Amino acid sequence: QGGKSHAKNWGPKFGDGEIVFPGMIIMRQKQGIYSPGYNVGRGRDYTIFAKTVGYVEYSKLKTERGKTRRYIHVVPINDDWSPEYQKLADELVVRRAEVKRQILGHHVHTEPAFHFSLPQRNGNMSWLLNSVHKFPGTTTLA
């Protein structure tokens, strides 16, 4: 009788000259209307995301067969295309997290603090429990 499907927000998220950080989504589209340019990626559903720190750019290209192609680019901070820019981006990522924690305040906790320790698997932290809970380092050999 009635009914409606859940809405999908297709469209751009940033304009020309806006600053982005790695992992941020720039475009949500149902078809490949826009193609990935430099310093960007594309998901299996045609989601375009940034892969470095920089500013968003838009450009148009005319192909060999007379079709129009549209790209999305991310430009480095000072137009630095050298391979040394990657380490600068890594430092900026660490700094950005510190800025956010300072603004939010101490009472917005960003790590858990339980009365027990989480198990370790394959050298990383795991959220799955072991069959038995034991204190670390409270037993000797044999």
Binding residues vs RNA (CB under 7 A): 1-13, 15-19, 21-25, 28, 30-33, 41, 43-47, 49, 51, 58-60, 63-65, 67, 69, 93, 97, 121-122, 124-132
Q: Which residue, 82 or 136, is less far from RNA as judged by CB?
A: 136
Q: Tell the smallest beta-carbon distance from residue 68 to RNA (Å).
A: 7
Q: Tell the smallest beta-carbon distance from residue 82 to RNA (Å).
A: 18
DSSP secondary structure, the chain, as one string: ----PPP---EES--TT-EE-TT-EEEE-SS-SSEE-TTEEE-TTS-EEE-SSEEEEEEEEE-TTS-EEEEEEEE-TTS--STTHHHHHHHHHHHHHHHHHHHH-TTS--S---SSPPPEETTEE-SSPPSS---TT-----
Q: Tell the smallest beta-carbon distance from residue 77 to RNA (Å).
A: 11
Q: Which residue, 84 or 125, is less far from RNA as judged by CB?
A: 125
